[PDB]
Design an enzyme around this catalytic site. Structure first.
Site, PDB file in Angstrom:
ATOM      1  N   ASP C  70      69.168  49.482  56.482  1.00  4.64           N
ATOM      2  CA  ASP C  70      70.563  49.618  56.027  1.00  4.64           C
ATOM      3  C   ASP C  70      70.854  50.516  54.814  1.00  4.64           C
ATOM      4  O   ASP C  70      71.938  51.105  54.713  1.00  4.64           O
ATOM      5  CB  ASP C  70      71.135  48.231  55.703  1.00  4.64           C
ATOM      6  CG  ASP C  70      71.279  47.356  56.928  1.00  4.64           C
ATOM      7  OD1 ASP C  70      72.234  47.581  57.702  1.00  4.64           O
ATOM      8  OD2 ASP C  70      70.452  46.437  57.097  1.00  4.64           O
ATOM      9  N   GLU C 196      82.823  42.271  54.963  1.00  6.20           N
ATOM     10  CA  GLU C 196      83.306  43.338  55.842  1.00  6.20           C
ATOM     11  C   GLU C 196      84.720  43.106  56.353  1.00  6.20           C
ATOM     12  O   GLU C 196      84.953  43.031  57.546  1.00  6.20           O
ATOM     13  CB  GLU C 196      82.318  43.492  56.998  1.00  6.20           C
ATOM     14  CG  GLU C 196      80.927  43.866  56.511  1.00  6.20           C
ATOM     15  CD  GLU C 196      79.873  43.834  57.585  1.00  6.20           C
ATOM     16  OE1 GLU C 196      80.017  43.064  58.558  1.00  6.20           O
ATOM     17  OE2 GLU C 196      78.876  44.575  57.441  1.00  6.20           O
ATOM     18  N   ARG C 211      84.498  38.535  58.099  1.00  6.47           N
ATOM     19  CA  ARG C 211      83.313  38.005  58.743  1.00  6.47           C
ATOM     20  C   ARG C 211      82.683  36.944  57.824  1.00  6.47           C
ATOM     21  O   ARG C 211      82.488  37.199  56.635  1.00  6.47           O
ATOM     22  CB  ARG C 211      82.326  39.159  58.990  1.00  6.47           C
ATOM     23  CG  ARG C 211      80.865  38.780  59.205  1.00  6.47           C
ATOM     24  CD  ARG C 211      79.998  40.023  59.259  1.00  6.47           C
ATOM     25  NE  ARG C 211      78.574  39.732  59.410  1.00  6.47           N
ATOM     26  CZ  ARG C 211      77.626  40.632  59.677  1.00  6.47           C
ATOM     27  NH1 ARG C 211      77.921  41.922  59.848  1.00  6.47           N
ATOM     28  NH2 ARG C 211      76.362  40.247  59.784  1.00  6.47           N
ATOM     29  N   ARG C 290      75.460  41.603  70.596  1.00  5.57           N
ATOM     30  CA  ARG C 290      76.474  42.635  70.369  1.00  5.57           C
ATOM     31  C   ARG C 290      76.617  43.508  71.625  1.00  5.57           C
ATOM     32  O   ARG C 290      76.324  44.711  71.616  1.00  5.57           O
ATOM     33  CB  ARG C 290      76.132  43.473  69.136  1.00  5.57           C
ATOM     34  CG  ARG C 290      76.306  42.714  67.822  1.00  5.57           C
ATOM     35  CD  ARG C 290      75.557  43.374  66.671  1.00  5.57           C
ATOM     36  NE  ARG C 290      75.845  42.719  65.393  1.00  5.57           N
ATOM     37  CZ  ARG C 290      75.514  43.196  64.193  1.00  5.57           C
ATOM     38  NH1 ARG C 290      74.867  44.356  64.058  1.00  5.57           N
ATOM     39  NH2 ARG C 290      75.845  42.503  63.116  1.00  5.57           N
ATOM     40  N   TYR C 325      80.094  46.852  65.514  1.00  5.32           N
ATOM     41  CA  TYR C 325      81.221  46.600  64.639  1.00  5.32           C
ATOM     42  C   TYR C 325      82.530  47.046  65.275  1.00  5.32           C
ATOM     43  O   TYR C 325      82.547  47.886  66.173  1.00  5.32           O
ATOM     44  CB  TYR C 325      81.039  47.352  63.306  1.00  5.32           C
ATOM     45  CG  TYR C 325      80.091  46.703  62.307  1.00  5.32           C
ATOM     46  CD1 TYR C 325      79.136  45.770  62.704  1.00  5.32           C
ATOM     47  CD2 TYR C 325      80.146  47.046  60.954  1.00  5.32           C
ATOM     48  CE1 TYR C 325      78.281  45.182  61.781  1.00  5.32           C
ATOM     49  CE2 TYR C 325      79.290  46.468  60.024  1.00  5.32           C
ATOM     50  CZ  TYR C 325      78.361  45.539  60.443  1.00  5.32           C
ATOM     51  OH  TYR C 325      77.506  44.962  59.536  1.00  5.32           O
TER      52      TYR C 325
HETATM   53  C1  LIG Z   1      73.940  43.075  52.827  1.00  8.13           C
HETATM   54  C2  LIG Z   1      74.897  42.072  53.509  1.00  8.13           C
HETATM   55  C3  LIG Z   1      75.685  42.639  54.673  1.00  8.13           C
HETATM   56  C4  LIG Z   1      76.792  41.763  55.207  1.00  8.13           C
HETATM   57  C5  LIG Z   1      76.357  40.576  56.051  1.00  8.13           C
HETATM   58  O1  LIG Z   1      74.818  43.211  55.674  1.00  8.13           O
HETATM   59  C6  LIG Z   1      75.361  44.152  56.566  1.00  8.13           C
HETATM   60  C7  LIG Z   1      75.130  43.681  57.980  1.00  8.13           C
HETATM   61  C8  LIG Z   1      74.502  44.653  58.937  1.00  8.13           C
HETATM   62  C9  LIG Z   1      74.998  44.280  60.323  1.00  8.13           C
HETATM   63  O2  LIG Z   1      74.992  42.946  60.587  1.00  8.13           O
HETATM   64  O3  LIG Z   1      74.501  45.038  61.337  1.00  8.13           O
HETATM   65  C10 LIG Z   1      74.781  46.111  58.712  1.00  8.13           C
HETATM   66  C11 LIG Z   1      75.288  46.506  57.331  1.00  8.13           C
HETATM   67  N1  LIG Z   1      74.800  47.838  57.009  1.00  8.13           N
HETATM   68  C12 LIG Z   1      74.899  45.549  56.249  1.00  8.13           C
HETATM   69  N2  LIG Z   1      75.556  45.989  54.987  1.00  8.13           N
HETATM   70  C13 LIG Z   1      74.770  46.472  53.878  1.00  8.13           C
HETATM   71  C14 LIG Z   1      75.456  46.922  52.619  1.00  8.13           C
HETATM   72  O4  LIG Z   1      73.570  46.519  53.962  1.00  8.13           O
END
Ligand SMILES: CCC(CC)O[C@@H]1C=C(C(=O)O)C[C@H](N)[C@H]1NC(C)=O
Ligand SMILES: *[C@@H]1O[C@H](CO)[C@@H](O[C@@H]2O[C@H](CO)[C@@H](O[C@@H]3O[C@H](CO)[C@@H](O)[C@H](O[C@H]4O[C@H](CO)[C@@H](O)[C@H](O)[C@@H]4O)[C@@H]3O)[C@H](O)[C@H]2NC(C)=O)[C@H](O)[C@H]1NC(C)=O
Ligand SMILES: *[C@@H]1O[C@H](CO)[C@@H](O[C@@H]2O[C@H](CO)[C@@H](O[C@@H]3O[C@H](CO)[C@@H](O)[C@H](O[C@H]4O[C@H](CO)[C@@H](O)[C@H](O)[C@@H]4O)[C@@H]3O)[C@H](O)[C@H]2NC(C)=O)[C@H](O)[C@H]1NC(C)=O
Ligand SMILES: *[C@@H]1O[C@H](CO)[C@@H](O[C@@H]2O[C@H](CO)[C@@H](O[C@@H]3O[C@H](CO)[C@@H](O)[C@H](O[C@H]4O[C@H](CO)[C@@H](O)[C@H](O)[C@@H]4O)[C@@H]3O)[C@H](O)[C@H]2NC(C)=O)[C@H](O)[C@H]1NC(C)=O
Ligand SMILES: *[C@@H]1O[C@H](CO)[C@@H](O[C@@H]2O[C@H](CO)[C@@H](O[C@@H]3O[C@H](CO)[C@@H](O)[C@H](O[C@H]4O[C@H](CO)[C@@H](O)[C@H](O)[C@@H]4O)[C@@H]3O)[C@H](O)[C@H]2NC(C)=O)[C@H](O)[C@H]1NC(C)=O
Ligand SMILES: *[C@@H]1O[C@H](CO)[C@@H](O[C@@H]2O[C@H](CO)[C@@H](O)[C@H](O)[C@H]2NC(C)=O)[C@H](O)[C@H]1NC(C)=O
Ligand SMILES: *[C@@H]1O[C@H](CO)[C@@H](O[C@@H]2O[C@H](CO)[C@@H](O)[C@H](O)[C@H]2NC(C)=O)[C@H](O)[C@H]1NC(C)=O
Ligand SMILES: *[C@@H]1O[C@H](CO)[C@@H](O[C@@H]2O[C@H](CO)[C@@H](O)[C@H](O)[C@H]2NC(C)=O)[C@H](O)[C@H]1NC(C)=O
Ligand SMILES: *[C@@H]1O[C@H](CO)[C@@H](O[C@@H]2O[C@H](CO)[C@@H](O)[C@H](O)[C@H]2NC(C)=O)[C@H](O)[C@H]1NC(C)=O
Ligand SMILES: CCC(CC)O[C@@H]1C=C(C(=O)O)C[C@H](N)[C@H]1NC(C)=O
Ligand SMILES: CCC(CC)O[C@@H]1C=C(C(=O)O)C[C@H](N)[C@H]1NC(C)=O
Ligand SMILES: CCC(CC)O[C@@H]1C=C(C(=O)O)C[C@H](N)[C@H]1NC(C)=O
Ligand SMILES: [Ca+2]
Ligand SMILES: [Ca+2]
Ligand SMILES: [Ca+2]
Ligand SMILES: [Ca+2]
Lengths: 388, 388, 388, 388
Positions: C70, C196, C211, C290, C325
């Site tokens: 990520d 998010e 979420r 997903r 998403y």
């Molecule tokens: C770090 C927590 C966050 C919210 C659950 O995770 C996300 C979930 C991930 C997702 O569930 O695929 C992708 C996102 N790239 C990630 N955001 C970050 C900044 O890393």
């Protein structure tokens, strides 16, 4: 927005300063770049553009093979901002295996010629729409400047030829208002062969230094009167002659009036311009081949038959490197009109047979009233690195 | 549209926040991307642009070989919007193996230097047209900032040097109005060697922190009076010195007046600016090589000889990663002028010999009055994944 | 140019009509296209733009390997006109491994977060210049919406979280005027975990459906009062729940107030919006993965706890194809404000292990007051055709 | 900016002059270029754009395989400036496997159709936002012109069909104001099958020449009254008929009223326009296959049943080369409305089986009141040089 008049004095210059270079061929060895030839430059009132005749293909592309040949239906006029090389997002302005373009202060005119050798069509596109067209009048490769046309007070002029490339032909000067041909004048005066004119505004008229492909290694002149459409013609006085091929400097001649019959057959598009009695001009360094490029001022080069005294020479491309066509373009400054020029740098065929294509890059210099040094700005590609 | 005056106070800052990064080298392993070095950033009143000197080639291209070399005729100044990497649609603004650019509120000025080492030419292009040129005055690699110039009320100033890179040289300060050189001032004051100045507006004048390549590991200063063209010079007071190479922090000195004669020979382009008696600066983390990059405020670093008390340090690039040149640029805000900087991230030669090219990416930070954390933003390419 | 107020009624709609699609992954197999994730869409008053977080590499590029991860320093925010895929001329707006952007009627705001997990920096860039920044307040991956922020009368709001992804965390709502943070409000009300957020103007306030990554498969709501900065929160009433994972439709629940503790851990960014007592929403078709994407209106879905009566369903992506998403964006029409949405279509890792990268394309639909039929608009790439 | 009325007389023409050509397929062998079909051209009041339906892939791309197929979810409408080939920076305007676009003097309207064969959706996008949509009314491939629509005084009209392609179908004429459907008129008159209309302004109304795919090798006409929404229809009088397939010129007929029942089934998109009693038209040179293209004026071709006297013929593409669809577009001049046309040049399947894709390039001509010569402007690619 107003029409250009170019009604300012010519900028007094001491030579030329580097302005642009596109590195097309170096880039073509690692990138999708158009195969081109017959480039030129022209600017609207805000910015400059490079133009060239595409070959309907990129260089690293099997369709590059055979592109030494001049006329196919797939050739189109490319137009980018100056310094943006001819990448795949380049706009093809029209269908053309010969062209000329200019801006009149309001919009762009493009003169685009394509079709059969014996029966070609010239289209006139103004402000993004086709306004006029004319068919071949001598059924032998209707053709035009391969550099910018010139417009004063809304009337653009352009020089076209139809007929033999090695004998007398039919040259005419068109006057075009918002893309509409309003008048045509035949060539008149003492020039006996006119190809690929490099024209420039010289208020209240337009002046062109062209190429004689029949009997002259001296360059013809065509003068265009924009008030009554009358035409005059002659040859550049300078005994240092601009064409290639030509005799060496000790055995070359011009009398301002007739072709010199000195290795007169063949030629290369070129340019020069007058400054009082003097002449600024460019030419290849080699007298027999399209190698190197040099500029200088010839003292009495405009007024004095056979003058050979030069001053303020500059190497543009050294004689170990290939050149090609060159042409003039003019740029309006605050108080004066400046002259600039481009040089086409030809790579591949016929000189370099490792590859099966022919293409070019450009280098561009502008007049300066300041000072400068020396250098050499060739194409720069290693032929051995190129896709064949 | 009006001339920039920059007549606002300097923004009070607590450090710097991330602003831009182009990932040039990572992209070059899956894309056609220009080989570059000597980058910088400058903004017109609306938006920012990244600049750099191309090597007339893309990276995945056999012409990339040998690009560690500094000066060839094919180098041109590239200009994109900040964040747009140097793809094949990038405009080559001019021919340049050394450059500086800046916007005066109305139009862009570019200062571009190319040609022979012993007899170079600098072109001055303003608002898309060549306005002036100057030849070499010491016949030894005429050269300029490699970062933005600065304009106040229609006059832009730039710092140029000609002469030895390891000995006394001839440095001059040019004042340029709409592309036209109106005055030239010799370097004056106590600075003994001036290279690659990073200048910024400090109304009513301009201030530069530069590179001493002869006897100083401390950074020279040049102050330019825009009202009377007078010049003064000195060295950055801070005993924490900004050049590379340099002595370590325990044995480093500066007295604000003379080069410190501590590992003085060689150098690297860099920057600093004053805030009252304090100094914000950056430098490489390594003191011998162009590795890592760090910023900090030095308390009394501007006003107090040899001050070594820093605060608000930030790693920009960690010391496991290659850095290179850095320079300042200024961005006008609603009520103050902010200072930003870029770091050139050099990859390939001489440090990484798996590949035969030298290129760079950039990372960019801007001053902030808010808060921030930590990180490291290096180039990010795996040298083993690159075309050689 | 004036500030957006969004002070028009919401457009009454019957469903959604197809709007855009970029085919990124299909194109990546024959072209240089950015590796991305976390896309979204936002429009200024004239046109729409697609955004996404780059991975500092193209897909056909060895640097694509490992891009399931990520957060790296090389991630930047890409911004093109909607429908222009992420080619090499795409502008990298800022450094970001998490972001949000919106236009206030005058200029763009971008919220960009990068740096160390334990100590990240959020930059605030407005009208092309860095105006503010804030460091991490809980030292655990400061992060934001990954969709558009919302501005009314010159104040933009954005929701950020810092802390555990699987437990209570620290969520705050920022209010930003021309890039300057003028106020921060802590999360308040009954939502127990916020990630998010998909927000939208609901004059005179802003409403977000987010979420819950800890205890809820029902989606939290956050309501933002732009007049006094007060915050409220709750959960979407609909018994047809929007998150993934979730219980099947017969065994799923929501009481509008607390997380439902039904496969609550984990999640996916999503959206819904209210229409009187009813709710338009989207979700994946698969309840555990997903896969697929569907929209529908839930009768009493906003007002009535545990309502499960739906009408006007539309398949967006069938359940044989990968989704990801999704988020909302709003578009001002002549008399009403329309809601649109995008769906991220994730290819590669972790689901498709033939390849070593992770990337996405998008598909975009907008609200319509007319009629429509059926279809399925998946990514479309054959995984077996892709560079690995 | 004001609504187009097109209230000028039709330009009197003598034939057509070359205007543009994109060389798409030649470029595709050395470049990343979109796979397309169903191209067209339409111009706003300043400049012209080429459009086409992408296949969600580039040509040198394994996803090119199978693109002979007409309808997939990944097809999107591409829009570039005329002459800019469909490179990776091309904008995908909407999701579409059938489309029409036109500019009303203020903004662009796009009509885009996608989704299931039996239940398709047409989106109406005006000025960058979705304004309306309509579902299929006959559950059998709702479809539209594949060339420009026409707007007068803010109302744009477009022709759509739903139903059998080889039997009676349901054709309707929509009237659209700023993206919003304000009225729908059923087809009326004597035309019995309407596909792929090529329409043009004929103030105060609009006129279309279309494709009868059931019983006519002669071309249907549809006349649209913009003032009262009434419709009428007939067939092109000329006994020289425009469809392909067709009978040869000696055994071909049309009575202006009914399909001629001569090789009537199947067809190809085409065009013609009236000038008084005469007809300008184009067609394939071959009467059975999509090979070659020719234009000519038919004396009495509009007013006289079965007229077969042509004049002013021009070869556009010779009969050794593949053509395809063609359509009209209109360009407003200073004092008259000119008619231009494009020809789709189809390469690959089904005719050329060495490759597994189907794509096209275009060539474009505009009416001229001047003179012209001859030529042939085919696609120009060597199928043996193409990626398969
Ligand atoms: C770090 C927590 C966050 C919210 C659950 O995770 C996300 C979930 C991930 C997702 O569930 O695929 C992708 C996102 N790239 C990630 N955001 C970050 C900044 O890393
Ligand atoms: C640094 O650069 C400057 C500027 O370019 C340069 O000054 C220029 O030198 C050239 C060469 O001497 C000068 O041009 C010459 O002018 C004389 C008249 O005085 C002519 O006789 C020359 O023509 C003859 O020689 C040429 C070879 O040089 C032949 O090719 C030609 O056929 C003739 O036989 C030539 O025109 C020019 O005037 C100056 N420019 C200025 C502004 O002074 C200077 O030489 C460079 N310095 C060094 C050390 O290289
Ligand atoms: C989260 O991020 C914040 C912001 O970056 C960070 O706070 C900063 O920490 C640094 C390092 O401690 C501070 O800078 C120091 O200031 C002291 C004076 O008070 C100086 O002595 C330091 O210089 C010495 O130490 C350096 C190594 O740190 C040496 O390189 C140097 O040669 C000196 O010997 C240094 O300047 C800085 O002031 C704060 N910034 C703020 C706004 O508080 C915080 O530490 C981060 N936390 C974590 C856990 O990452
Ligand atoms: C052509 O397209 C149109 C427009 O898309 C389409 O009409 C739509 O059909 C769907 C499916 O029947 C309708 O949505 C349903 O509405 C009923 C309420 O009457 C709900 O019960 C449905 O939900 C249940 O069924 C779903 C499966 O369909 C389950 O997934 C869900 O969990 C529920 O159990 C569903 O919401 C929709 O209202 C219409 N739209 C309109 C405007 O009428 C039409 O069916 C298509 N024609 C053909 C032949 O396919
Ligand atoms: C140079 O170019 C010009 C312009 O293109 C060209 O003049 C054109 O020639 C054509 C062909 O002769 C003319 O069109 C013909 O007109 C006559 C009526 O006068 C028709 O009978 C012709 O149709 C018959 O012949 C066709 C084959 O040519 C058949 O396909 C057809 O089925 C008919 O049987 C045809 O329409 C046209 O009018 C002129 N244009 C002008 C403006 O004069 C000239 O011929 C070219 N010269 C050369 C040497 O290439
Ligand atoms: C480019 O095209 C030329 C001409 O078609 C090719 O040269 C010919 O190659 C054939 C095949 O062996 C020879 O038999 C001919 O004698 C060659 N012709 C000439 C004029 O030399 C050439 O092979 C092509 N080159 C590339 C790189 O594709
Ligand atoms: C890049 O250029 C260098 C220098 O030309 C190449 O290295 C030379 O290779 C030749 C044989 O090809 C050797 O004889 C020389 O000894 C090499 N020179 C040096 C200084 O090592 C090198 O091969 C080129 N690199 C690539 C990737 O093509
Ligand atoms: C992508 O990177 C991964 C991880 O570095 C590579 O997978 C490893 O490959 C090595 C070399 O044989 C193995 O020993 C490791 O066990 C692999 N790691 C894992 C986690 O599976 C992979 O080879 C790379 N893929 C590509 C296409 O370059
Ligand atoms: C394009 O797709 C076709 C259809 O899938 C491929 O042709 C098939 O290839 C398989 C084996 O790979 C054969 O068993 C089938 O008989 C083929 N089908 C037909 C209808 O011929 C073809 O290989 C693909 N082309 C390329 C260049 O990859
Ligand atoms: C056809 C005569 C003409 C002028 C001498 O030849 C030119 C010379 C050629 C040149 O000498 O290299 C290149 C030009 N492409 C060609 N022009 C055309 C239209 O073919
Ligand atoms: C020639 C002296 C100069 C200043 C130290 O050298 C620079 C240092 C080089 C190096 O320090 O990286 C890079 C520059 N490309 C070079 N500038 C020019 C014009 O060649
Ligand atoms: C479905 C009927 C229709 C009209 C004849 O077929 C067209 C003819 C096809 C063919 O004649 O080339 C190409 C078109 N892509 C197709 N249109 C659609 C929407 O599929
Ligand atoms: Ca000659
Ligand atoms: Ca030094
Ligand atoms: Ca959850
Ligand atoms: Ca038919």
């Amino acid at each position: 927005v107003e029409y250009r008049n170019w009604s300012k004095p010519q900028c007094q210059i001491t030579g030329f300063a580097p302005f642009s270079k596109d590195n097309s061929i170096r880039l073509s060895a690692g990138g999708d770049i158009w195969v081109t030839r017959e480039p030129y430059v022209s600017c609207d009132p805000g910015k400059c553009y490079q133009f060239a005749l595409g070959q309907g293909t990129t260089l690293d592309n099997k369709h590059s093979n055979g592109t030494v040949h001049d006329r196919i239906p797939h050739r189109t006029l490319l137009m980018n901002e100056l310094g943006v090389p001819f990448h795949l997002g380049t706009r093809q302005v029209c269908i053309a295996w010969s062209s000329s373009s200019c801006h009149d202060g309001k919009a762009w005119l493009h003169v685009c010629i394509t079709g059969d050798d014996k029966n070609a069509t010239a289209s006139f596109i103004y402000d993004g729409r086709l306004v006029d067209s004319i068919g071949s009048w001598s059924q032998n490769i209707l053709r035009t400047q391969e550099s910018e046309c010139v417009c004063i007070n809304g009337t653009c002029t352009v020089v076209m030829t139809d007929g033999s490339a090695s004998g007398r032909a039919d040259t005419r000067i068109l006057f075009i208002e918002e893309g509409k041909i309003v008048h045509i004048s035949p060539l008149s005066g003492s020039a006996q062969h006119i190809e690929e004119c490099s024209c420039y505004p010289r208020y209240p008229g337009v002046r062109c230094i062209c190429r004689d492909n029949w009997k002259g290694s001296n360059r013809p002149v065509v003068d265009i009167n924009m008030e009554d459409y009358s035409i005059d013609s002659s040859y550049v006085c300078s005994g240092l002659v601009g064409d290639t091929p030509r005799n060496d400097d000790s055995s070359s001649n011009s009398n301002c009036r007739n072709p010199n019959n000195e290795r007169g057959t063949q030629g290369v598009k070129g340019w020069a311009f007058d400054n009082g009695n003097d002449l600024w001009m460019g030419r290849t360094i080699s007298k027999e081949s399209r190698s190197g490029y040099e500029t200088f001022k010839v003292i009495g080069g405009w007024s004095t038959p056979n003058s050979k005294s030069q001053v303020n020479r500059q190497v543009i491309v050294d004689n170990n490197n290939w050149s090609g066509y060159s042409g003039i373009f003019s740029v309006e400054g605050k108080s004066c009109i400046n002259r600039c020029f481009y040089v086409e740098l030809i790579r591949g065929r016929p000189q370099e047979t490792r590859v099966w294509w022919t293409s070019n890059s450009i280098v561009v210099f502008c007049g300066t009233s300041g000072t400068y040094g020396t250098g050499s700005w060739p194409d720069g590609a290693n032929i051995n690195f190129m896709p064949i």
